[PDB]
């Protein structure tokens, strides 16, 4: 009756602690999801084991094979039974997998090398020296291929036909691509992120602006799992508590190198 | 087979059009849940009647006789099919009706007349001068109940018991205090409604602090209710669209006074 958990290796929400080598099971693992999971399964009354995602991905549906990948896809398998974990809530993914009301919330920001003189999507729109882009797929992507806001849909024209490439194949990339290319690059990218990497060593990155859209991370299960309904409501009651909050401010803030 | 939609007047949410005197049915009304209602509506392929909440109250559940009133209370017994409205989600909540993912996101604030000496929540716990207090029946005063937080615990203990009453029965009853109260009272209300009303004249008013917590409005069916999972692919399709975050700007900054 061990409970199967599907996460990501995804700082700070899941991180290999200092001596990982020398420990075992859930105790290898610290984060935020960590420690969201040890109160999910307090709150629902079970025993459960955390397994890193074998492939490393979110959830997508490949448009051929029409196969699920990631975390969404253990799901969709009946290879895990539950997914904690920074996964946003998607029509697609909805579709095929249940999820909590949301954990976090976010939204599309922008992130800048300190000294860079950006300080809005409006400015970024209006000019051409600063570079900027977006992961090369993905709900921030789609974001602003789709939107009739006409700044954004200026950005689009442009990101979508610059040379060379302004979109990055993952995360750690566009966050590089900021902090090497001496403030002629801007990211777009999700809040949480942008807040975390502001926290930390070398403290050279600052998120500027309001965020663009809003969106929730929410705890997924397979469709029609009987435990949907206890996790979902184990996140509220955590959430009323204000024990995601405290979640929030221990690994974003409290320590934070910045 | 018409959708009885209960909704609470509420703005911008729900008003009364300028000549509704002279108007019908769903026509007789405007605002964000309107606009909301007739897109859910457009998406999922049902005709509906908006309803004004015969109580007009939120919802909640009586300590004695355990009888749900407001909105939830409408879902509750079946006497509406949908409540489309600015319907917090809550546990409480969650376990007797069926939510979307939100719509929209909010957290308690404080309102306070220009000029008034409170900057936080904890200011107004540890002095008496200014009284402060709620809506009757809505999510402000259940959070405030039900909390151990020892702030807020401290807070509950105070608006209980206090002479005259600080809570009040609408929301446009809360701000008219705080407007004639010289500074004397200070209204705890959810960010969207304070935000709003900011931007409008007389000007007189302001958020102050933080946010005391986050959480977010969902579109409501009763339990088991078919309608529910349609409704909720409906949300997340909207937001996709940017729709949502188009009637927000619509309704609220673009409608600014100040
Ligand atoms: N949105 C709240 C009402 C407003 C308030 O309680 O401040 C509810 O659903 O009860």
């Known amino acids: 009756k061990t409970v199967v958990v599907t996460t990501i290796l995804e700082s700070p929400y899941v991180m290999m602690k200092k001596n990982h080598e020398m420990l075992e099971g859930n105790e290898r693992y610290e984060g935020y999801c960590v420690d969201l999971a040890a109160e999910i399964a307090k709150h629902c009354g079970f025993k459960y084991k955390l397994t890193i ?31 904690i974990a920074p996964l946003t809530i998607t029509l697609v993914r909805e579709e095929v997998i249940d999820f909590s009301k949301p954990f976090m919330s976010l939204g599309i920001s922008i992130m800048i090398k300190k000294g860079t003189p950006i300080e809005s999507a409006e400015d ?5 020296e600063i570079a900027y882009g977006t992961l090369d797929s993905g709900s921030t992507k789609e974001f602003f291929r789709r939107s009739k806001i006409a700044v954004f849909d200026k950005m689009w024209t442009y990101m979508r ?7 990055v194949r ?3 990339e566009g966050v590089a691509r900021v902090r090497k290319s001496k403030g002629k690059y801007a990211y777009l990218l999700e ?3 942008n807040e975390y990497i502001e926290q930390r060593k070398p403290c050279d990155t600052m998120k500027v602006g ?14 029609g799992s009987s435990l949907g309904n206890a996790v979902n409501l184990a996140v509220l ?20 190198e910045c």
């Open 53 to 83: 995602v074998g492939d490393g991905k979110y959830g997508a549906r490949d448009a051929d094979t029409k196969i699920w990948n990631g975390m969404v896809g253990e799901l969709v398998y009946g290879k895990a039974d539950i997914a």
């Open 124 to 128: 970024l729109s209006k000019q051409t």
């Open 161 to 167: 036909s610059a040379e060379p490439s302004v979109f």
């Open 170 to 172: 993952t995360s750690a």
């Open 191 to 193: 809040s949480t992120m």
């Open 210 to 223: 309001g965020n663009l859209d809003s969106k929730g991370y929410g705890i997924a299960t397979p469709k």
């Open 237 to 256: 009651k955590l959430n009323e508590q204000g024990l995601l909050d405290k979640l929030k401010n221990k690994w974003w803030y409290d320590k934070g």
